[PDB]
Scaffold this active site. Structure first.
Site: not given
Lengths: 105, 636
Positions: A30, A33
């Site tokens: 992701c 993050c």
């Protein structure tokens, strides 16, 4: 200066831990993050004594995230005595986090 | 000969009122229109053509028109109306007989822009109107658009609710297409000789001066249409007690198969699942599926070995799970599941298309009665138990009817013996009767076990390569050539069989850019009754020839069996003594009121099967075997 949580060690490191616990509900692949991971490292260092910073990879610890209604990631959860005091989803900044925490501190 | 087509308020299963019908007489050369207050005279007009021994032309009349006019005459006029099977013609059946090779034919019809994409290859009346150029429109559409400029809306299939002058005009439209389609079928001289103008003959001349295939197909369509109306008795409670055992097993399996994999949702029947899995448990795909990522691949799953014991042990849980979905998706949750098709008589009325194939082997759907899991397949034992004559009451005693299941004993191999008796003078044929033909094939092809000979003879005859053959001995495409050539040397007649016949349809062949441009003598193999049975490639064709023989044998077989049973004195239906419930290619399921009737059914079927063999002078001997019992799991 960062805590790794599992599903089993989420009860003791977070729910039974006195003091503010900042949990990053993140994942391997992701984007927002991967950017804030350096941010928590300095915040964990600065808020030593005050805050405990912890990271939970929901691809390997996927039973905890549903329980706290994780909508998007990264999801920051400020635990205060097992209870979630304040939550923030996504990326962020350090000065805005400082304003955020000291308002709750 | 008269030509007609009718319009009712609904389908054969709840039709209530007769609207209109048009009758074109070839002797009068003029049409006659009928209306709701003219239903009575309509039945007499049909009776009059029967008295003259003429003919009555309907489209799908055998399956709908004739039984509906029998049904409508009972509740509206309270009179008995039964069109004799001999005095009825079905353009739909002849279309399926004469133009079984429509799928190619449509290519040129597509280029024209004359044939709708929704009506490609279809044998419906309107679909043929565009082919012959007789479609001025369609009743359903001249109804919808005219309802707009009237106000009120449209409900799915309300155009048939009430008699309207637009239906009466399009009722004629269905008649003129039937007539022109009839003449289009009568203009095929392979089936209808020129020496006889069949448009003006009696029924006595029509059947005999036409090709034999014409007669069987109308006898086949009439009988199977009776079978649909008979239906297959169904134990609803039993299937319900299975979905319970399956849904509980599915959920319990789903639970265990969600502990093995997380989320952010484990899917029962998704392709994006195993694609996401196993290639994370340590499995590198041996075989892929097309443009991207392998399919479910039930095959490899048996052989998938991953170092993760939980993932490995979960594979067999996936194997069961997918299968559980299959029965459920067939017995409950499917759009064409069985529980949805049970009629209010406690029976499943599965439809069947007579010559819905090149060879003549029928097709079943809504629901596909011919794919019910076998007793050997898991939960098939319970499934087969749900389809049984015992699940039917009785007109009098109420004591459950007994079921008689009779199949054609090894029809395929005996059909092979018949066409190869032309080259070996009954050698291979006697090996069938003497027994252990799979033992001889084992010796001839040099296979280690008799079972390997069984899977060989069927694969080789039907055009299997070498992989399925090679996997028999644990190999690949390599092992196969020597297994096939050795069988050919030890059984010359089989090789000689493909010699004269495969060279009966060619003059010379030629390869052009990888496509064989064979100069044909006729792109169609003759069946047992002279019909056209096309193939495709001359490389095998034998599979088409044998399956054509087998399907044409059983078709006549089930006709004569019922014909003899009726001749002996038995009445057909749930109100008589026996009722056809299902015909599955080489086996049949017949309901019987008493065990004594079932025993006669079994004997008669064998008597009919020998009759068929004498009729077409079959070189090999045909036999059948019957089983008496309560249901289908017993009859097989």
């Amino acid at each position: 200066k960062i805590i790794h949580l599992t599903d089993d060690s989420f009860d003791t490191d977070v729910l039974k831990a006195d003091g503010a616990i900042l949990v990053d509900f993140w994942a391997e692949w992701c984007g927002p993050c991967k950017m804030i991971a350096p941010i928590l490292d300095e915040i964990a260092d600065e808020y030593q004594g005050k805050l405990t910073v912890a990271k939970l990879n929901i691809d390997q610890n996927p039973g905890t995230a549903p329980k706290y209604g994780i909508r998007g990631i990264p999801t920051l959860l400020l635990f205060k005595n097992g209870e979630v005091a304040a939550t923030k989803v996504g990326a962020l900044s350090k000065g805005q986090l400082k304003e955020f925490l000291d308002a709750n501190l | 000969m008269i030509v007609s087509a009718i319009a009712a308020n609904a389908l054969l299963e709840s039709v209530t009122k007769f609207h209109c019908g048009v009758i074109y007489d070839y002797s009068t050369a003029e049409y006659v229109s009928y209306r709701p207050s003219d239903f009575g005279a309509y039945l007499d007009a049909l009776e009059a053509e029967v008295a003259r021994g003429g003919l009555i032309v309907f489209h799908n009349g055998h399956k709908y028109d004739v039984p509906a006019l029998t049904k409508l005459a009972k509740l509206q006029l309270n009179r008995e109306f039964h069109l004799p099977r001999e005095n009825c013609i079905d353009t739909l059946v002849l279309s399926r007989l004469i133009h079984s090779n429509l799928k190619d034919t449509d290519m040129g019809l597509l280029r024209s822009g004359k044939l709708p994409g929704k009506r490609f290859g279809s044998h419906a009346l309107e679909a043929w109107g565009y082919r012959l150029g007789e479609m001025k429109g369609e009743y359903k559409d001249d109804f919808k658009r005219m309802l707009e400029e009237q106000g009120e809306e449209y409900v799915d299939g309300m155009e048939w609710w009430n008699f309207n002058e637009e239906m009466m005009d399009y009722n004629v439209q269905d008649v003129v297409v039937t007539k022109a389609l009839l003449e289009k079928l009568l203009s095929d001289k392979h089936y209808f000789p020129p020496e006889i103008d069949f448009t003006d003959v009696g029924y006595t001349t029509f059947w005999s001066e036409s090709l034999e295939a014409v007669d069987i197909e109308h006898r086949a369509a009439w009988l199977l249409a009776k079978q649909e109306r008979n239906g297959f008795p169904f134990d609803t409670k039993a299937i319900e007690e299975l979905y319970v055992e399956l849904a509980a097993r599915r959920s319990e399996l789903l639970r265990k198969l969600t502990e093995t994999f997380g989320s952010w949702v484990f899917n029962p029947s998704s392709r994006d699942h195993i694609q996401k899995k196993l290639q994370e448990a340590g499995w590198v795909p041996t075989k892929y599926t097309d443009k991207g990522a392998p399919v479910v691949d039930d095959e490899v799953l048996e052989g998938v070995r991953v170092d993760d014991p939980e993932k490995q042990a979960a594979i067999d849980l996936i194997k069961e799970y997918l299968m559980i979905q299959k029965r459920i998706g067939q017995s409950a949750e499917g759009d064409k599941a069985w529980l949805r098709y049970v009629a209010e008589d406690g029976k499943i009325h599965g439809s069947v298309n007579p010559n819905g194939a090149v060879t003549g082997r029928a097709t079943h759907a809504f629901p596909n009665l011919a794919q019910i899991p076998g007793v050997r397949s898991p939960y098939g034992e319970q499934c087969r138990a749900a389809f049984g004559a015992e699940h039917h009451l009785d007109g009098i005693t109420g004591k459950p009817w007994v079921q008689a299941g009779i199949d054609a004993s090894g029809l395929e191999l005996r059909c092979l013996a018949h066409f190869m008796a032309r080259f070996d003078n009954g050698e291979y044929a006697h090996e069938i009767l003497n027994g252990d033909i799979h033992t001889k094939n084992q010796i001839a092809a040099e296979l280690p076990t008799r079972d390997n000979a069984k899977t060989f003879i069927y694969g080789f005859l039907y055009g299997a390569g070498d992989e399925k053959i090679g996997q028999i001995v644990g190999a690949g495409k390599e092992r196969g050539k020597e297994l096939k050539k050795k069988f050919l040397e030890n059984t010359p007649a089989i090789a000689a069989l493909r010699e004269s016949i495969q060279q009966t349809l060619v003059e010379s062949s030629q390869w052009v850019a990888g496509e064989q441009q064979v100069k044909w003598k006729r792109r169609w193999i003759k069946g047992l009754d002279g019909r056209k049975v096309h193939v495709r490639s001359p490389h095998a064709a034998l599979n088409t020839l044998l399956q054509s023989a087998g399907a044409l044998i059983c078709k006549l077989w089930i006709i004569k069996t019922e014909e003899m049973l009726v001749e002996k004195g038995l009445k057909h239906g749930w109100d008589g003594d026996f009722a056809y419930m299902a015909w599955v290619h080489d086996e049949i399921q017949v309901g019987c009121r008493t065990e004594e009737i079932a025993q006669v059914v079994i004997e008669t079927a064998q008597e009919a099967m020998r009759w068929v063999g004498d009729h077409w002078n079959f070189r090999c001997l045909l036999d059948t075997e019957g089983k008496m019992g309560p249901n289908w799991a017993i009859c097989h």
